[PDB]
């Protein structure tokens, strides 16, 4: 009879939950296909 009984598996393979906070929520993302991205800053300012 031991062969006649079969355990029932779960419905979905479940995994360990890991946090999704990624700094992508506060940083600025851009949609840029180009092999890179450039930004242009003013490390100093003019004078008056």
């Amino acid at each position: 009879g031991g062969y006649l009984v079969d355990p029932q598996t779960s419905e979905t393979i479940r995994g360990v939950l890991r946090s999704t906070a990624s700094l992508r929520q506060i940083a600025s993302v851009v949609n840029v296909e180009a092999t890179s991205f450039d930004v242009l800053v003013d490390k100093t300012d003019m004078g008056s």
Partner: protein, 41 residues
């Protein structure tokens, strides 16, 4: 003042005025210019 019943009552005081001048200077900047629209920016 508080005047008396029988007194002079002459020429109490008057504020001395003062005029403060605001020279209205100017603040000048001259950068040279050599997508960016740096002109408007």
């Amino acid at each position: 003042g508080w005047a008396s019943e029988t007194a002079a009552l002459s020429e109490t005081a008057t504020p001395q005025i003062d005029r403060i001048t605001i020279p209205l200077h100017e603040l000048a900047a001259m950068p040279k210019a050599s997508a960016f629209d740096i002109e408007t920016w």
